[PDB]
Amino acid sequence: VAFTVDQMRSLMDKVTNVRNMSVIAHVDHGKSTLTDSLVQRAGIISAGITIKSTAISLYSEMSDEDVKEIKQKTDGNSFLINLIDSPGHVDFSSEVTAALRVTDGALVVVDTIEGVCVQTETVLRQALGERIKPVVVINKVDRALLELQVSKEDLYQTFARTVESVNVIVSTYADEVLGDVQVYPARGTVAFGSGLHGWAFTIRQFATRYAKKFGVDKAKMMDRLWGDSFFNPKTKKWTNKDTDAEGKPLERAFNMFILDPIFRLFTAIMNFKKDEIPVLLEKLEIVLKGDEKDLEGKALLKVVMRKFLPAADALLEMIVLHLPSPVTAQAYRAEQLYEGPADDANCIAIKNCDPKADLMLYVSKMVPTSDKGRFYAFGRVFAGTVKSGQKVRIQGPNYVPGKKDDLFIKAIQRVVLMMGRFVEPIDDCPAGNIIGLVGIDQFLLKTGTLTTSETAHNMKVMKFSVSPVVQVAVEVKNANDLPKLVEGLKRLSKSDPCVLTYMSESGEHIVAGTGELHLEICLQDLEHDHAGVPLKISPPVVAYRETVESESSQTALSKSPNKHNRIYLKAEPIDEEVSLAIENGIINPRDDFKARARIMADDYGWDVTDARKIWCFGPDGNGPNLVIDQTKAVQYLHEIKDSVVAAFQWATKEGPIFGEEMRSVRVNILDVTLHADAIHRGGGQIIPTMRRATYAGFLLADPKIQEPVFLVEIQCPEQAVGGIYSVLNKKRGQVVSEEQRPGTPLFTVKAYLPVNESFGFTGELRQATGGQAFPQMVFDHWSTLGSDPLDPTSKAGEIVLAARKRHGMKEEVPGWQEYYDKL
Amino acid sequence: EFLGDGGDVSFSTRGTQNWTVERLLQAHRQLEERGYVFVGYHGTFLEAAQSIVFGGVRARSQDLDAIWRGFYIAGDPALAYGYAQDQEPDARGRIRNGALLRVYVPRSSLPGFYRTSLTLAAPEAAGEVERLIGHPLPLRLDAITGPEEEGGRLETILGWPLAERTVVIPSAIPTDPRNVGGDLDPSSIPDKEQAISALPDYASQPG
C-alpha cells in the first residue's frame, strides 16, 4: 500500500507495533521467493535518488482480538515490519552479523525433505547469540507430495522431526535468560507451505476456521490440531489414544482437518478429475474467477492453493504475534550491544528504547545512492531521536570516550526512509526504527556509532577494513571494448567503499579488494554489469610492502640529466608506532606543521626540528612514508619542492624491490645543488633525480618486505573446534585466543592468518569442520619477513623473483649502484 | 615500408611493441639493399618517436636565425639514450621513459657528411664547419660530426634538408621504465644490433 511521510512517521511512533527482523534461509530454499511474497502483499510504497535495496517496509493490520494474543505490550491494530536484507552465502560472515545485529526477530526457513541444512543451522546459532527470537517455516512441502507422494502421516512425522531438529539448536544455543524460545506448531510459531505455488498455513489458521464447527475456543482447537489428538469419525468424540475401543487405528487431528483438505485438492486437480474439482472447491469456499476456471494441472493447483492458503498472511501472522518489537528485545539485548557500563546513562536508554535520551544510532552499513558517488548510512536508532539538521558525534571504530581520535562532530544533512530502492525524507525518527542518514559517507567508512552524549561508548563494532591486500590486473579480451572497461572500473569503485581500481605505471588496470572472495565478487559484477564486456583477469595476487631495516649504509646521490643538479639523501626506518599513527589519522598530512610536530616530538620521540621540516607524505600524499628536509642553506631550494614531492609520490607507490608500495620509509634530504637558472631545474630534471636518489638510499638502507596478515575470528561448536587448529597449522596460523560462550558448547577461536596463505581458506575450513564453523576475518597488521628479498632462494626473495618475472622485469633486483650517480 | 614485417609497431613505456632483434635485422638488411646507410641513433619521447617513424622527421618552425639548427643524433646509443625520455612532467608528475631510434639516410648523401675535432659550440667551430661544408651555416643537405663538448662523446647534426630525407626505425635497445635517468647499461644492447651499427667514414677535408 502507499503511505505518506506522515503515515509512516506516525506508524514509526508506535514502536510497540514495529517488527525488526531478517530471513534466515539458504538461497536454494526459496529464501527470495517467500520474501517476495511478503513484498507483493504488504510491501510499503511512498505516496529521484535511488539506493541499493537494503530493507523493505511491510504493513499489516490485525483484529483487536488478535492484538490480544500478543504476549508483549502493544498499541493499535497497525504494525510496521522492517524486513532487513541478508547475504546469499554464509561466506559473507561480516555482513551476516551486520543484519542480525540490527534485527530482533527472525523468520527461519527450513526444507521439508532436507530439513535444516548446515548453513542455515550455522546462521541460526549466530542469530541466537545476538538474542534473536526464531520463528520457523517449513518450505517446499509441494515436493513431498508431487515427487515423493508421501502419505499424510509420513509428512506429519517429517515435520515433527524437522521441528525437533530446529529446537535441538534453539534450546542448545539460545540464552537461558530469554526463556524457552523453542518453536511449537501448536503455538503458531511454525508455518508450513510452498513458496513455489505461493501457499502456507499455521495451525492457528485452521484453528480459527474449525473454531466453531466444534464449539471450541481456538485455544484448544489449535492445541488439538497438533500432536496426539484424535477425532473418531464414528463416535464423533475426541480422544488421546490412536485406537478406538476395538483396536482400530485413528487418524491424527492434523492429518484429518489440515493435511486432508490439502491432499485432496492436490489429488483431485493433478489427476484432472473435473467432476470432483468443482465440488471439492465449493466445499472449501474457494471461488475461481472466470479466467482461472479453465486452468488445469499445475497451472490450476497453483491458483487454487494461493486463494486457499495465501502464503504471505501465514508468515505475516507469525511475525506480528510472535516476533519481538523494538521494545521487548532491546531490554535484553542492550547490554550485549553496548560496549560501555551496563548501567551507563545510555545503556539504560537502550534497554528502555527511550526517544528522549541522548541519541544512540547504530550504523550497520553504507549503501550506494544514485546521488553522485555518495553513500547513505543505514542503521537503527536504539535511543533518542535523530533529526535532519541535527548535529551529531560520529564515533568511528577506533573511538574511545577518553581521547578525540576517530571523532567527527558534524551535522546530519538529511534523514531518509529506506523504502527498498527509493528514499523518502523525514524530519526525525524515534528510537526503535531502522532509518537512513544523508551526509556521513566521508566520516564513516562502513560501520560506526552516532551519539550525543559526550560520555557515550560505541556499540558492538563490526570489524571491517579498507586495506587492499588482494588485487588482479584486468584486460579486455577484445580491444574494441577498452573504453567500456575504463568506465565500469570507474563505476565499480563507485558502488563499493572498499574496492579499488587504479593504474600502475606500467599502465595496467588494477582491481584490489579486502579479500579473495570480496575481490572475486567484484570481478564478477564487473564482467557482468559495470562493464559487461569480456575481460582477461590475471590470477589473484597478494599485496606486499617495501621497507628498510636501517639507515642507508652511505649517503645516496643522484644527478639530473643536465648533470647540473644533485640530490644527496639518506633513508631510514619509521617506527611501526609512527606508521600506525599515520595510518590512523593521529599524525596527519593536513594538520598544522607546528601542531603535528608537537605530537611527533612529544608522543613519538621525534626531534621537533625534523618534524617541522616534513615536506610530504606518500604514496597518495598521505602514506606512512616521509621526506624530511634536512638541507642547510641551499639557494632556490623551495623552487624544486613540488618536484621532489612529485618524485616522492612515485618512488613510494612502486618501490625498487619489485614494484610494491613503500611503508615506514623516512627519507632525509641531506643536500642539494642546483643550476642557478630555473630553465635547467624543471620537473623533467629534478623529478628523475629525486626519484632515483630515493631508490638508491632505500636499496642502501637494508631492504626488507612486509606481508599483510589477517585476524580471523571463528565461531565453532566445541566438537569441530578440532578442525580449526588442523587447518591453521598448515597455513602458518597463529592462535591468539580461544574462549567459550558461557552456557552453550560454542567456542570462538581468534588467530592470525597470513593473507598470502588465505586462498581457499573458507573452503578448506568447511571440509575440516563439517561446515559447522563460521569465519570472520579482517586485515590486522603488516609483518616484516626476516629473509633477504635480494637472495632469490630466501623466502622473501622467492616472492620477489616470482613477482618480478610475473611483471616481466629483470629477474634480479637492481643494485643501488644503478640508481646512484654513475660515477 | 622499411620496418620489416610482423604486425603494427608502436611505442610503449612498457617497451616497443612488435619489435624483436630478428625483425630489426631484416629491416636493416632491406634498408641497405635499397641503398641506405645507418648514421646514428636518436632518442626521444614516445609520442615523438611514433611521429618520426610514421610520418618521418620534419623540421617545423625553426628559428631561422639559429645557425646550428638541425637534427641531432649520435653514433653512440648511450649518448642518444640520455634524451630518451619526457622532458617535462605530465600533470600528475610522471616523467616516463622514451625510445631509441635508428636513423638512416639515402646512401647517396654520404658525400655531405663531414667530421671535425672542434666542439660544435666553440668560436672556431662555426668557421671550421662552414669551411668543411662549403657555405655558411646552417647545415643544409650536409651533416657535421664532432665532440658534444670537450672530451665528450660525439654528436652528429644532420641539417634539416638532409634530416627530412632520413628513414628511421626502432632500436632493439630498450629504455628502462624503472630507471628513468640512469645511463644505458651496455649489456642491454643486443650483440646482433651491435653488428649492424658501424658508422660511415666521414670526411675531414672539404669537397
Curated annotation (Swiss-Prot), chain A:
Cellular component, GO annotation: cytosol; ribonucleoprotein complex
The places in or outside the cell where this protein is found are:
Cytoplasm
Query: Is the keyword Acetylation in the record?
Result: no
| InterPro entries the record matches | EFG_II, EFG_III/V, EFG_V-like, EFTu-like_2, G_TR_CS, P-loop_NTPase, Ribosomal_Su5_D2-typ_SF, Ribsml_uS5_D2-typ_fold_subgr
**Residue numbers of N6,N6,N6-trimethyllysine PTMs:** K490
By what means is the activity of this protein regulated? Inhibited by fusidic acid and sordarin, which prevent the release of eEF2 from the ribosome after the translocation step. While fusidic acid acts on all eukaryotic eEF2, sordarin specifically binds and inhibits only selected fungal eEF2.
Q: Which reaction does it catalyse?
A: GTP + H2O = GDP + phosphate + H(+)
- Keywords, in A-Z order: Cytoplasm, Elongation factor, GTP-binding, Hydrolase, Isopeptide bond, Methylation, Nucleotide-binding, Phosphoprotein, Protein biosynthesis, RNA-binding, rRNA-binding, Ubl conjugation
Per the record, residues carrying Phosphothreonine are T694, T744
Tell me where the cross-link Glycyl lysine isopeptide (Lys-Gly) (interchain with G-Cter in ubiquitin) is found: K822
- One annotated GO biological process: maintenance of translational fidelity
User: Impact of mutating S504 to F/P?
Assistant: Causes resistance to fusidic acid and sordarin
Positions of GTP binding: 25-32, 139-142, 194-196
Give the modified residues of type N6-methyllysine: K490, K594
The segment(s) forming the tr-type G domain are 16-327
* One Pfam family linked to the record: EFG_III
EC number per UniProt: 3.6.5.-
In the UniProt annotation, what is the result of changing V755F?
A: Causes resistance to sordarin
Q: Which residues carry this modification: Phosphoserine?
A: S560
> Mutating H680N leads to what result?
Leads to conditional growth defects, sensitivity to translation inhibitors, and decreased translation
The UniProt function text for this chain reads: Catalyzes the GTP-dependent ribosomal translocation step during translation elongation. During this step, the ribosome changes from the pre-translocational (PRE) to the post-translocational (POST) state as the newly formed A-site-bound peptidyl-tRNA and P-site-bound deacylated tRNA move to the P and E sites, respectively. Catalyzes the coordinated movement of the two tRNA molecules, the mRNA and conformational changes in the ribosome.
User: Any other noteworthy remark?
Assistant: Present with 160782 molecules/cell in log phase SD medium. There are 2 genes for eEF2 in yeast.
Its name, as the record gives it, is Elongation factor 2
